[PDB]
Enzyme design. Structure first.
Site, PDB file in Angstrom:
ATOM      1  N   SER A 111       7.837  22.215  28.431  1.00 21.83           N
ATOM      2  CA  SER A 111       6.494  22.329  27.967  1.00 21.83           C
ATOM      3  C   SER A 111       5.557  22.838  29.058  1.00 21.83           C
ATOM      4  CB  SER A 111       6.080  20.991  27.395  1.00 21.83           C
ATOM      5  OG  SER A 111       4.766  20.917  27.053  1.00 21.83           O
ATOM      6  N   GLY A 284      14.880  17.436   9.841  1.00 20.76           N
ATOM      7  CA  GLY A 284      15.268  16.919  11.128  1.00 20.76           C
ATOM      8  C   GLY A 284      14.224  17.011  12.202  1.00 20.76           C
ATOM      9  N   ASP A 315       8.387  25.292  17.353  1.00 21.40           N
ATOM     10  CA  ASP A 315       9.270  24.160  17.571  1.00 21.40           C
ATOM     11  C   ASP A 315       8.600  22.829  17.212  1.00 21.40           C
ATOM     12  OD1 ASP A 315       7.573  23.497  19.603  1.00 21.40           O
ATOM     13  OD2 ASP A 315       9.055  23.607  21.209  1.00 21.40           O
ATOM     14  N   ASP A 355      14.041  21.044  18.285  1.00 16.13           N
ATOM     15  CA  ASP A 355      12.611  20.934  18.318  1.00 16.13           C
ATOM     16  C   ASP A 355      12.083  20.534  19.692  1.00 16.13           C
ATOM     17  OD1 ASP A 355      12.354  18.126  18.254  1.00 16.13           O
ATOM     18  OD2 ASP A 355      11.839  18.124  16.219  1.00 16.13           O
ATOM     19  N   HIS A 356      10.776  20.579  19.843  1.00 21.35           N
ATOM     20  CA  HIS A 356      10.117  20.299  21.077  1.00 21.35           C
ATOM     21  C   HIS A 356      10.544  19.007  21.747  1.00 21.35           C
ATOM     22  CE1 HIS A 356       6.934  21.550  23.749  1.00 21.35           C
ATOM     23  NE2 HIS A 356       6.540  20.304  23.837  1.00 21.35           N
ATOM     24  N   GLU A 358      13.371  17.179  20.652  1.00 21.08           N
ATOM     25  CA  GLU A 358      14.805  17.060  20.618  1.00 21.08           C
ATOM     26  C   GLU A 358      15.445  17.651  21.863  1.00 21.08           C
ATOM     27  OE1 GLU A 358      15.919  19.115  17.017  1.00 21.08           O
ATOM     28  OE2 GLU A 358      15.750  17.347  15.800  1.00 21.08           O
ATOM     29  N   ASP A 363      13.499  12.922  20.685  1.00 21.96           N
ATOM     30  CA  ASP A 363      13.755  12.816  19.242  1.00 21.96           C
ATOM     31  C   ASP A 363      15.247  13.090  19.065  1.00 21.96           C
ATOM     32  OD1 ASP A 363      12.170  12.496  16.535  1.00 21.96           O
ATOM     33  OD2 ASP A 363      13.471  14.127  16.161  1.00 21.96           O
ATOM     34  N   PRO A 364      15.910  12.307  18.237  1.00 16.98           N
ATOM     35  CA  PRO A 364      17.334  12.492  18.040  1.00 16.98           C
ATOM     36  C   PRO A 364      17.720  13.766  17.305  1.00 16.98           C
ATOM     37  CG  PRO A 364      16.503  10.971  16.449  1.00 16.98           C
ATOM     38  CD  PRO A 364      15.396  11.222  17.405  1.00 16.98           C
TER      39      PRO A 364
HETATM   40 CA   LIG Z   1      15.432  15.330  14.975  1.00 23.49          CA
END
Ligand SMILES: [Ca+2]
Ligand SMILES: [Zn+2]
Length: 392
Positions: A111, A284, A315, A355-356, A358, A363-364
Site C-alpha cells: 500500500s 471472497g 483490489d 485483494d488488498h 488478502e 483477510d483470508p
Molecule cells: Ca477473502
C-alpha cells in the site's frame, strides 16, 4: 542463485503496526501467520518497520530512517516550520547498524508503504535541497537524511501501492469510511473499537503532532478526535499523499534511482459488468471493502481529474491501474517483466488475483498460497546482482 546477502525490511501502508502491537496479530501475515518469521526460517534475514499509518510519506521516511540506523527522528527544520509540527520525534535504537557500515537492504512494501519506500530512497540518495538551504540560511543543524549520498537500498518492491493515488479518496463520505476501514482492520485482529483498552494496542505514532489516545478513550472516540486534527486536515498527511493530485505531486520529485532495483506487484479482485463497463467486487473480497469501497472504486469516473475506465479495476481499496509504478507526474520508466530484473526502472511483475488485505494475510483466502508468494519473492531479491554485466 543467491547473489546478495542483503536483509529484507517490511513496510506497511496507511494501516500497520509493530510486531508487539495488536496483541501479536501481524500486519505482515494476519490470520495466515507471520511472514517475517517464515522468511527468517527459510534463510532470508528479515526485519519489520512500524511508522505512522496516517502520517505523510515524508514523515514516514524520516521515521524509517531513524528506525533503521538509530537515533531521534528529525523531520527537518524547514518541513516542520512549513507544516507546524515538531521537528524532532521519537528515538529508536536502530534495527540495522550494518547500514552505516556499507550494507544494503531490500524493502518490501504494501500500500502506501510503496510511496514511503520510494521517498526514502530519494532522500537517502539526493537529500533535500530545501532542507539544506534552510539550514544554511538559518544556522540550524541538518539531518544526514537531507545531505544525500547514501547507498543503503538495493531494491524496492511494492505491493498494491497507489503510485498514482487511489480514487477512494474521492468518496463524499471518505472521512468516515476511511476510519471505518481502520475499524475493520482492528476487527480482523479481534480488537473492538468501542472499548477503552488500557494497553496501547495500536499506536498511531503521532508524536510530532502531539496526538495520542487518552485514558478512558475507545478507538471510536480517538478516531473522532483524529478526523478533526492536523493529521487529517493538513496537506502533510497520508490523506493528501493518497489522493490522485497528491500522488502526482509526490511523483514530480520522487524519482527512481538508477542504483536500485524496483519491482511492482498489482492486485485485483473484481469482475467487469458487460452493460455498465463498471467493475464489481468478486466473491471472497474482504467484507468491508466489498460493501463500502469497491462499488465506488469500480464506478467512479472524473474526466477533468483524468479518471477513466482504466481506473475501475481494483483490489477493494486501490485502483489496479495505479500500482505498476508512478506515471502521473513521473519520469520513471516501467518495463513489463521479461525474465530479467533491471536496475533503475520499474519491473512490472503483473497483476495477482488477490485483494488488498488478502495479499498480506489480514483477510483470508485459502486459494492464495501466501507462503509461496513471499518465498518466491525473497528468492528473487536474493538473486539480484549488485553490479552485473553486458553480453550478447
Ligand atoms: Ca477473502
Ligand atoms: Zn510532517
Amino acid at each position: 542463485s543467491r547473489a546478495n546477502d542483503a536483509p529484507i525490511v517490511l513496510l506497511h501502508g496507511f494501516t500497520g503496526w509493530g510486531r508487539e502491537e495488536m496483541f501479536g496479530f501481524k500486519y505482515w501475515g494476519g490470520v495466515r501467520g507471520d511472514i517475517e518469521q517464515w522468511l527468517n526460517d527459510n534463510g532470508y534475514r528479515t526485519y519489520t518497520l512500524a511508522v505512522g499509518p496516517l502520517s505523510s510519506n515524508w514523515d514516514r521516511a524520516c521515521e524509517a530512517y531513524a528506525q533503521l540506523v538509530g537515533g531521534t527522528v528529525d523531520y527537518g527544520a524547514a518541513h516542520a516550520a512549513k507544516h507546524g509540527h515538531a521537528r524532532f520525534g521519537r528515538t529508536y535504537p536502530g534495527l540495522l547498524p550494518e547500514l552505516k557500515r556499507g550494507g544494503r537492504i531490500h524493502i518490501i512494501a504494501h500500500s502506501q508503504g510503496g510511496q514511503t519506500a520510494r521517498m526514502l530512497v530519494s532522500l537517502l540518495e539526493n537529500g533535500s535541497q530545501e532542507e539544506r538551504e534552510y539550514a544554511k540560511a538559518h544556522n540550524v543543524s541538518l539531518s544526514p537524511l537531507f545531505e544525500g549520498g547514501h547507498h543503503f537500498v538495493l531494491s524496492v518492491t511494492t505491493i498494491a501501492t497507489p503510485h498514482d493515488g487511489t480514487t477512494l479518496v474521492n468518496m463524499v463520505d471518505f472521512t468516515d469510511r476511511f476510519f471505518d476501514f481502520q475499524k475493520a482492520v482492528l476487527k480482523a485482529a479481534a480488537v473492538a473499537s468501542n472499548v477503552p483498552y488500557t494497553s496501547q494496542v495500536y499506536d498511531f505514532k503521532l508524536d510530532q503532532w502531539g496526538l495520542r489516545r487518552q485514558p478512558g478513550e475507545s478507538f471510536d472516540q480517538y478516531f473522532e478526535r483524529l478526523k478533526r486534527s492536523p493529521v487529517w486536515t493538513s496537506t502533510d498527511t497520508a490523506r493528501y499523499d493518497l489522493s490522485v493530485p497528491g500522488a502526482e505531486k509526490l511523483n514530480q520529485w520522487v524519482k527512481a534511482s538508477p542504483n536500485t532495483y524496483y519491482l511492482s506487484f498489482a492486485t485485483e479482485r473484481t469482475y467487469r459488468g458487460a452493460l455498465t463497463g463498471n467493475y464489481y467486487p468478486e466473491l471472497g473480497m474482504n467484507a468491508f471493502s466489498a460493501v463500502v469501497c469497491a462499488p465506488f472504486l469500480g464506478s467512479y469516473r472524473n474526466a477533468t481529474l483524468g479518471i477513466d475506465d482504466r481506473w475501475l479495476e481494483n483490489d477493494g481499496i486501490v485502483n489496479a491501474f495505479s500500482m505498476n509504478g508512478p506515471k502521473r507526474g513521473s519520469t520513471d520508466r516501467i518495463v513489463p517483466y521479461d525474465g530479467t530484473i533491471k536496475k533503475g526502472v520499474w519491473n512490472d511483475m503483473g497483476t495477482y488475483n488477490v485483494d488488498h488485505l488478502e495479499v498480506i494475510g489480514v483477510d483470508p483466502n485459502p486459494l492464495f498460497d501466501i507462503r509461496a508468494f513471499y518465498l518466491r519473492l525473497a528468492e528473487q531479491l536474493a538473486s539480484l546482482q549488485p553490479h552485473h554485466h553486458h553480453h550478447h
